[PDB]
Amino acid sequence: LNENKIIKLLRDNIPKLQLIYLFGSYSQGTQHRNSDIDIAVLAADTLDNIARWELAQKLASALDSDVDLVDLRSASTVLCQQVVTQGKQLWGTQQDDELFAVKTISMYQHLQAERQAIIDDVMA
Amino acid sequence: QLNENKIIKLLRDNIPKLQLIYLFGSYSQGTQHRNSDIDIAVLAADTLDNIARWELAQKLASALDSDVDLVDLRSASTVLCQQVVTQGKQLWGTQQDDELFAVKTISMYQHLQAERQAIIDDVMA
Amino acid sequence: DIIINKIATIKRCIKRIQQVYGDGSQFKQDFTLQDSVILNLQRCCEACIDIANHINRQQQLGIPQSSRDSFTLLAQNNLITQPLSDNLKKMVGLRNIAVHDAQELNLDIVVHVVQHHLEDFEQFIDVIKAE
Amino acid sequence: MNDIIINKIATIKRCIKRIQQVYGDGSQFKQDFTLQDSVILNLQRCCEACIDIANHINRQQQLGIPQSSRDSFTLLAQNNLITQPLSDNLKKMVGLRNIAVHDAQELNLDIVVHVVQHHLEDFEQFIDVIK
Amino acid sequence: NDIIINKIATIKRCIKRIQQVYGDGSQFKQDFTLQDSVILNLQRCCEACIDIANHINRQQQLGIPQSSRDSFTLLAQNNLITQPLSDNLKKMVGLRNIAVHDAQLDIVVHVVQHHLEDFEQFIDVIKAE
Amino acid sequence: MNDIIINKIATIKRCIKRIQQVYGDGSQFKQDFTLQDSVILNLQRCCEACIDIANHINRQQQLGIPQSSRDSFTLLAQNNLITQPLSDNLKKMVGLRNIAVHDANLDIVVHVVQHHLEDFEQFIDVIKAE
Amino acid sequence: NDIIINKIATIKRCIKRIQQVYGDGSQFKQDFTLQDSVILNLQRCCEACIDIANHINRQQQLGIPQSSRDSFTLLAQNNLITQPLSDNLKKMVGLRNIAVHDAQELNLDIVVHVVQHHLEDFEQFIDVIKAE
Amino acid sequence: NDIIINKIATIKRCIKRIQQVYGDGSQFKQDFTLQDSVILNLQRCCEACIDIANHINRQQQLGIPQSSRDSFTLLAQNNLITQPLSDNLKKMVGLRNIAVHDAQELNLDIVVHVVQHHLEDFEQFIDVIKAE
Numbered sequence A: 001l002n003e004n005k006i007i008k009l010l011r012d013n014i015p016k017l018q019l020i021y022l023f024g025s026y027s028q029g030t031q032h033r034n035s036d037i038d039i040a041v042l043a044a045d046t047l048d049n050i051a052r053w054e055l056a057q058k059l060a061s062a063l064d065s066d067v068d069l070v071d072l073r074s075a076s077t078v079l080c081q082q083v084v085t086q087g088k089q090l091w092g093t094q095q096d097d098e099l100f101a102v103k104t105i106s107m108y109q110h111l112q113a114e115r116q117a118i119i120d121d122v123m124a
Numbered sequence B: 001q002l003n004e005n006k007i008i009k010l011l012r013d014n015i016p017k018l019q020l021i022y023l024f025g026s027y028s029q030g031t032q033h034r035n036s037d038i039d040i041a042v043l044a045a046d047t048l049d050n051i052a053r054w055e056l057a058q059k060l061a062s063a064l065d066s067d068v069d070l071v072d073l074r075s076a077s078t079v080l081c082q083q084v085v086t087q088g089k090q091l092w093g094t095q096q097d098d099e100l101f102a103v104k105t106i107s108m109y110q111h112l113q114a115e116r117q118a119i120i121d122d123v124m125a
Numbered sequence C: 001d002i003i004i005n006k007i008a009t010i011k012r013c014i015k016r017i018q019q020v021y022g023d024g025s026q027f028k029q030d031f032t033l034q035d036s037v038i039l040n041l042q043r044c045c046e047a048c049i050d051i052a053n054h055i056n057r058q059q060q061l062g063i064p065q066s067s068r069d070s071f072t073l074l075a076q077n078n079l080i081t082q083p084l085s086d087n088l089k090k091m092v093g094l095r096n097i098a099v100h101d102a103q104e105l106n107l108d109i110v111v112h113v114v115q116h117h118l119e120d121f122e123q124f125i126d127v128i129k130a131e
Numbered sequence D: 001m002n003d004i005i006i007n008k009i010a011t012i013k014r015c016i017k018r019i020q021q022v023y024g025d026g027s028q029f030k031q032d033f034t035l036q037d038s039v040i041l042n043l044q045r046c047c048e049a050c051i052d053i054a055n056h057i058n059r060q061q062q063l064g065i066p067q068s069s070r071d072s073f074t075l076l077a078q079n080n081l082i083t084q085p086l087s088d089n090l091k092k093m094v095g096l097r098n099i100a101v102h103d104a105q106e107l108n109l110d111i112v113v114h115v116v117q118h119h120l121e122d123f124e125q126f127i128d129v130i131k
Numbered sequence E: 001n002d003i004i005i006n007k008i009a010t011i012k013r014c015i016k017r018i019q020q021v022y023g024d025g026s027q028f029k030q031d032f033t034l035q036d037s038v039i040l041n042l043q044r045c046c047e048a049c050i051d052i053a054n055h056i057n058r059q060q061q062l063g064i065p066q067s068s069r070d071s072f073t074l075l076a077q078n079n080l081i082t083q084p085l086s087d088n089l090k091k092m093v094g095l096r097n098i099a100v101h102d103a104q105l106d107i108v109v110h111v112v113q114h115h116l117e118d119f120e121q122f123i124d125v126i127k128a129e
Numbered sequence F: 001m002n003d004i005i006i007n008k009i010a011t012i013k014r015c016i017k018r019i020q021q022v023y024g025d026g027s028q029f030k031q032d033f034t035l036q037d038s039v040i041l042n043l044q045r046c047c048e049a050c051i052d053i054a055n056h057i058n059r060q061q062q063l064g065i066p067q068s069s070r071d072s073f074t075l076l077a078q079n080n081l082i083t084q085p086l087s088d089n090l091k092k093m094v095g096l097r098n099i100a101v102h103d104a105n106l107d108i109v110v111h112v113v114q115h116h117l118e119d120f121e122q123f124i125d126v127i128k129a130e
Numbered sequence G, H: 001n002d003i004i005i006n007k008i009a010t011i012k013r014c015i016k017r018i019q020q021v022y023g024d025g026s027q028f029k030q031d032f033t034l035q036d037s038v039i040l041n042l043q044r045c046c047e048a049c050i051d052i053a054n055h056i057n058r059q060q061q062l063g064i065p066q067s068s069r070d071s072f073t074l075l076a077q078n079n080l081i082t083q084p085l086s087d088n089l090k091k092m093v094g095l096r097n098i099a100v101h102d103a104q105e106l107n108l109d110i111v112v113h114v115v116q117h118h119l120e121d122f123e124q125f126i127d128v129i130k131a132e
């Protein structure tokens, strides 16, 4: 997987970009044939839902594969936890990654206490 | 690539009074790309039950590890029957049954083209 | 215009069938008698397909995948009823084998159409004229 | 010649003779529609059997699958299985058939008589060539 | 795992949405939007099962599923799910190809009436860890 | 010319009509999931019919074996059968088969209905001229 | 009902505690203990609101929250709370997440605005939960 | 690390904010505002402790803790913090929950005992993490 191609397209299109992560099958090595590339980005502002989708399709065209682009600033705590745990950092400072993880893990630990009852009830 | 013997065996073992088996998708042409569909056409004495046909398509799909489209030629449209007669590859059945089916559909498609020509021309500007 | 000519042809053919037929004691034996009605029954079918295909073309209903589809498109777009559509589709088969192919003992179904299903052609041309 | 060819040839022989019975002196023919309806039907049965032969050979010989009856004879002529004049006379025969069944009000009737008297051996020539 | 939790909930949601939309069956055959909803939600149950299956194969290191159907064979081979359950879940993999590709409703109704229990049976065996 | 080209074009036309009929103004759209589900499925049906038309033209015209659903549009653009903007737009729709299922993103669906249905109609008209 | 009423009381108490500690607001901007008290009773308010939301999501099987904000999203999606109220209550969560740490990422102007024109949102939320 | 030094600074400020607010404790049990200010700064000391534990568990790849308590447990297993201190920090998170989410059930006798004696558990943690 051309990670350099990924870093260039996102830097050239996202203003005030801070972090680029590769998650899902590709980050672990479970990357098969009809695989969907998963990318998580964090910038100073939130990316518009339409703008982000169109950008994922730009990466999809250049990579010749379906790409799922996630804006960490607007994604769920569950999704952010999945990125800090399974994800591989492609771009950004070590500091920004650490700061994002500390915020995420704390928020996820708080969410677990809040929704534990809902989790137990569905999982029987 | 494609186990035709398995296809013949499974259909013969599940369809009563089976007359013809045809392979007609990308596989019959060799244009069979990866993550392709297996397209099979059958003709038996009686029209197959829709659910029985779908259930059998899934039985073949499990055995062949690929999506399987099973077509009953007795209920299929004239357009679809013409596709099978043109690009199809006969896997099982008599030459008599194939030639009879082929001449029955070519004539019906020719009569159909005469009727729907104006509709086709009108929609194809 | 073409629908009006096609309706006129249907009426002409039904009256032609009734004239040639009349009594049953002259059908099962005479071949020129059989050949006259079999052609005018096909003429009824073909003209019904043409009326259907003109409506399918004008109203942009779809592309028929079979001769039977000409009537299905009409019923799916609520222009004719499902019992009428099903009756007309059953009549296409009559035109198919029993007319342009030498045939054997299909005569018993041909007489059934003459004495009981000539009204289906009449119901169709009355429905189409009504719009 | 396989079963399909044998059975289709037999239909032409039977329907040609059937036209001959319905066409004796041919005096009462131009006045009675019943006699015209039998001649037109058996001529269509003769036409259809020839299309069926042509369609069968085109598929067997891998010449291509014709979209129309006219294309079936061109395919046979292009690969020299039949002569261009025969292909053209047989295509004229199916063109006659279409007018004779779908547009009876605009049918020449004089050409139909000319077809029975002279051009009826065009079907017979096709039987011999394919044999 | 959240993947397993959220995918189980998706199946639960989709089954409740199929049952709701279908109802008695009277209105189903006349409204294409109801047909489309039932069809899309069936594909959603199917992919959520494939996703759960792939996650289990990977974590428990059972093997590399070579296809969507293979995700269920690997589970059955490791006696995690029964062979008839596996065979039934594999039957659902063919549903995706029934909607999107025209390729020229009785099957949909048959599935709603008889194969929704296969998805529920799958949730139950996964919940039982 | 082929019945595949005719019917796949007929499918797109029918699916576009159904998308327009269901959506309408968009008021009742964000409330009823039944209306959302119908639009998405008919959008997925448009993507597939386009890819199927692309794959058929690449084989018939002998332009190469498409290496993916997106590469199918690349081979058409490379032979100038479709414009590069059209190619890129039709490729954006290739990613729309994944939005309904692997997710739970209705703003994207609305955007496609309002601004990208034209792409399928553009492709239909381009293929019509043989 | 037994737990929903308990949480309704804690919100009513905390609203009154905000009002009592803030008062005029003149001294608030300078006194740190006054800020510390208000910050905590605002946190207790939105935490008790999430607790109510999660109880409704549990008893009605509305869904599994993917975030603390998602607790109000599920009630709004199921038309139990009005959309503008859902957005306001989700903004309160944002304040809690920032205010859980030291007063360094401070916005006293945002804290003052919530006390002045946004405490109505917590009361408005109680008014719609009572209609079970 | 820069995140660790920043969080250590946070605990130092909040320990001093507890000592100043409580003062002599003569008016502590009487005044709700003094209780509210002590409880908020205790939570800020807890959160910065949990944040340090979460950071060290991720950076040193000791595991991912899905609870505040598991984060301290993981540090004890890997002998980064002593076990009596781990259970002391875990009991401090316990007090934080009942002090915030169920303030009416809270017994101040335990809070006072934490201010007077257990406020050095944070200082002990600040030094054992400083020795890298």
Ligand SMILES: Nc1ncnc2c1ncn2[C@@H]1O[C@H](COP(=O)(O)OP(=O)(O)NP(=O)(O)O)[C@@H](O)[C@H]1O
Pocket (backbone or CB within 6 Å): A023, A024, A025, A026, A030, A031, A032, A034, A035, A036, A037, A038, A078, A079, A082, A083, A086, E002, E003, E006, E007, E051, F102
């Ligand atoms: N329902 C869900 N709940 C939580 N996290 C999810 C969910 N679905 C997907 N994810 C996360 O998103 C990642 C990518 O999604 P997905 O593409 O479905 O998986 P994958 O492992 O990359 N498989 P594939 O792309 O088919 O090869 C997963 O690895 C999870 O971390």
Ligand SMILES: Nc1ncnc2c1ncn2[C@@H]1O[C@H](COP(=O)(O)OP(=O)(O)NP(=O)(O)O)[C@@H](O)[C@H]1O
Pocket (backbone or CB within 6 Å): B024, B025, B026, B027, B031, B032, B033, B035, B036, B037, B038, B039, B069, B079, B080, B083, B084, B087, E101, E102, E103, E104, F003, F004, F007, F008, F052
């Ligand atoms: N709408 C249609 N109308 C008529 N015939 C069709 C239509 N769709 C498909 N067919 C026929 O069915 C065959 C198989 O369908 P399909 O599986 O979609 O294509 P394919 O060529 O096998 N491509 P693939 O399996 O993806 O590699 C085609 O080759 C056509 O003969």
Ligand SMILES: [Mg+2]
Pocket (backbone or CB within 6 Å): A024, A025, A026, A035, A036, A037, A038
């Ligand atoms: Mg992926």
Ligand SMILES: [Mg+2]
Pocket (backbone or CB within 6 Å): A024, A036, A037, A038, A068, F102
């Ligand atoms: Mg994905």
Ligand SMILES: [Mg+2]
Pocket (backbone or CB within 6 Å): B025, B026, B027, B036, B037, B038, B039
């Ligand atoms: Mg195929």
Ligand SMILES: [Mg+2]
Pocket (backbone or CB within 6 Å): B037, B038, B039, B069, E101, E103
């Ligand atoms: Mg197929």
